Amino acid sequence: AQYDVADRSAIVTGGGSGIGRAVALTLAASGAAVLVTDLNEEHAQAVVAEIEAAGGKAAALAGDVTDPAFGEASVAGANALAPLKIAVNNAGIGGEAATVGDYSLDSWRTVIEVNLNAVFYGMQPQLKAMAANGGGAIVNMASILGSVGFANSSAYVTAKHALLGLTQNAALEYAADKVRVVAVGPGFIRTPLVEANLSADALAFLEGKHALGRLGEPEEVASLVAFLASDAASFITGSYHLVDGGYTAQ
Amino acid sequence: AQYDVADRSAIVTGGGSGIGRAVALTLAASGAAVLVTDLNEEHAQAVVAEIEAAGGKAAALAGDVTDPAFGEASVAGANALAPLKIAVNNAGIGGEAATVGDYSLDSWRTVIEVNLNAVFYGMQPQLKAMAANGGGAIVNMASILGSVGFANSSAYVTAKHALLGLTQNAALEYAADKVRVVAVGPGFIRTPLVEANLSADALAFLEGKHALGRLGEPEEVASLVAFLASDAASFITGSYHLVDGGYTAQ
């Protein structure tokens, strides 16, 4: 079931694996020219390879979203493929597993730098670009933890909470330039990253806290992002959109 | 009338003026020992002077909440007056007035640093301290802009959004130590600063956006903080509490 998203380029920050990868492939298959951005070049390229192999169009750009210069570069790169109309700010990281009191300052600043500032840095030329060439859609990977909290993952939830405000505000200011901005809110998704660190017993626990009694799969998050990034979602801006098997309904 | 808040000390960061000042005096009058923290010594001291003069106990501490060392210092200071319960993290700042796109990197990092990180830095020894001496209550000055957005004040709303998550999460992990953590959400408050820097036509606009058809007064915010910081509010932790003349109900 394809999404309108054609004739456009899309930046998929942290697109080398998991959700970002799913998002990259899903957009790509619906005609989108995807710039797969990632810290790991080998991962970013493997995805581009998958896209191309399945008929699609795509280029890789390995770097650090924390560096504002990398944001303008991703824009100019994607923009070289086709007019930039989508941007999925997916790149995030878990911080130290500890209480607010015990939390290292480095870890806290780091998690915020990646999960929140990088988004902002990236969003800046994204917004100017889409505003120039007629409109578009920025999708920010928030989380369930943008509206609820989770013991020992302070920095994560704080940053994910901050996206919602950044999203809202960007949506207000660039609505009149027909640039939409939305925030997706996944629950716990089984990505190889989440699966690699976190036990069998641990994941069982988190499963039980979702109404569906399982974790989400990356494609399940990718569908909603693909939709929201498309012309099909042309009256949706500023809003936060859960995909959490009824995690927050409790 | 009075709030339970006696026997103990309270930190009121940014307590030299406006809301913080109102909060300082209100707690002080109900028996609380208040540590009035501010960037200005002359302002912080004027308040201490007012408290002492009206029968109360208070000490001043001028510094920068950005500096984590200043957080431990405020704790040990307040704690010298009386065991520490109550902490009102009020200190914040407005950033540059511009779009997300045009926003300077300095300004954005600054407002985040003050409006979000400083709170976190401060909260850390606040939490360990109250957790040691039996329990207490941290009140974080969020805003209406922690749940809605406001054109050109991107960084502000993003940071105010982040407090809600920081609040929620701290509340979860130190609930069992009987340390409550809540977030207050004022609407536009008529402080002497706000009146000077804002036009007749501008104020008309902001007033009209509140259901009560006026801006709040600092004491109106101070009442709810005083209450939440008291033993009277002993089943309130993790929650966000609006005082906005029905700004967000629209």
Give me the DSSP letters along A107-172.
Answer: HHHHHHIIIIIHHHHHHHHHHHHHHHTT-EEEEEE--GGGTS--TTBHHHHHHHHHHHHHHHHHHH
Contact A112/B109, CB-based, under 8 Å?
Answer: no
Chain A residue at shortest CA distance from B122: A101
Number of compact structural domains in chain B? 1
Q: How far is it, in rounded angstroms, from Cα A36 to Cα B131?
A: 46
Q: In the 8-state DSSP scheme, what is residue B116?
A: I
Q: Is A198 exposed, middle or buried, given 0-12, 13-18 or 19+ CB atoms closer than 10 A?
A: middle
**Residue B71 CB partners (closer than 8 Å, separation 6+):** B65, B121, B122, B123, B124, B125, B126
A139 φ, ψ (degrees, to nearest 5) = -115, 120
Cα within 13 Å of Cα(A32), Cβ side? 33
Q: Which residues of B touch A151 (CB under 8 A)?
A: 169, 172-173
Element (H, E) at A53: helix A41-53
The chain B residue lying nearest A131, using CA atoms, is B101
**B212 alpha carbon, distance to own chain's centre:** 23
As beta bridge partners, residue B139 has: B88, B182
Cα distance between residue A38 and residue A58, in whole Å: 13
Question: Cβ A162–B165 below 8 Å, yes or no?
Answer: yes
User: Two tokens at A15?
Assistant: 């697109």
Residue A150: its chain B contacts at CB < 8 A?
169, 172
Residue whose structure tokens are 């008529």? B190
Contact B193, B103 (CB under 8 A): no
Q: Do B120 and A158 touch (CB under 8 A)?
A: yes
Distance CA A238, CA B213 (A): 26
**Any idea which residue has 């510094």 for tokens?**
B63
The arrangement of strands across the sheet holding A179-186 comes to A57-62, A33-38, A9-12, A84-89, A136-141, A179-186, A240-243
Contact between A101 and B131 using a beta-carbon 8 Å cutoff: yes
In B97-186 the beta strands, taken as DSSP E runs, fall at: 136-141, 179-186
The single-letter code of the amino acid at A10 is A
Residues A201 and A150: their CA atoms lie apart, in Å, by: 18
| b/e A160-185 (16+ beta carbons within 10 angstroms → b) | bbbbbbbbbbbbbbbeeeebbbbbbb
Tokens of B207: 């007033």
Over its C-alpha atoms, chain A yields an Rg (Å, rounded) of: 17
Q: How many Cβ atoms from other residues are within 10 Å of residue A35's Cβ?
A: 31
Closest CA–CA distance from residue B75 to any residue of chain A (Å):
13
Amino acid at B60: A
- Judge whether A242 and A160 are in contact, CB under 8 Å: no
Closest by CA position to B157, among listed A180, A228, A171 = A171
Q: Please tell me the distance in Å from A43's CA to the nearest CA on chain B.
A: 30
DSSP secondary-structure letter at A63? S
Chain-centroid distance, C-alpha B92: 8
Q: A50: exposed, middle or buried (C-beta count within 10 Å: 0-12, 13-18, 19+)?
A: middle
B13 forms beta bridges with B89
C-alpha pair distances (Å), B194 with each of A169, B140, B217? 21, 21, 11
The separation between CA B73 and the C-alpha centre of its own chain, rounded to angstroms, equals: 18
Structural domain of residue B145, as residue ranges? 1-250
Query: Measured between alpha carbons, how far apart are the two ends of chain B, in Å?
Result: 31
Rg, C-alpha atoms of chain B: 17
Starting at the earlier edge strand, list the strands of the sheet with B57-62. B57-62, B33-38, B9-13, B84-89, B136-141, B179-186, B240-243
Residue from the list B100, B168, B238 with its beta carbon closest to the beta carbon of A124: B100
Of A109, A164, A172, the CB nearest to B161: A164
Phi-psi map region of A50: left, alpha, beta (phi>0 left; psi -120 to 50 alpha): alpha
Asked if B156 and B145 count as a contact pair (C-beta separation under 8 A), the reply is: yes
Which residues, 6 or more positions from A159, have their beta carbon under 8 angstroms from its beta carbon? Answer: A92, A111, A112, A115, A116, B162, B165
Backbone angles phi, psi at B130, to 5 degrees: -60, -40
- Amino acid in position A165: G
Method in brief: X-ray
Which residue has tokens 């979860």? Answer: B172
Contact at 8 Å (CB) between A206 and A215? yes
d(CA A203, CA A199): 6
> DSSP of A162-212, one letter per residue?
HHHHHHHHHHHHTTTTTEEEEEEEE--B--HHHHHSS-HHHHHHHHHTSTT
CA distance A143 to B202: 36
Q: Beta strand A179-186 with A240-243: parallel, antiparallel or unpaired?
A: parallel
Q: Residue B230 in 3-state DSSP? A: coil
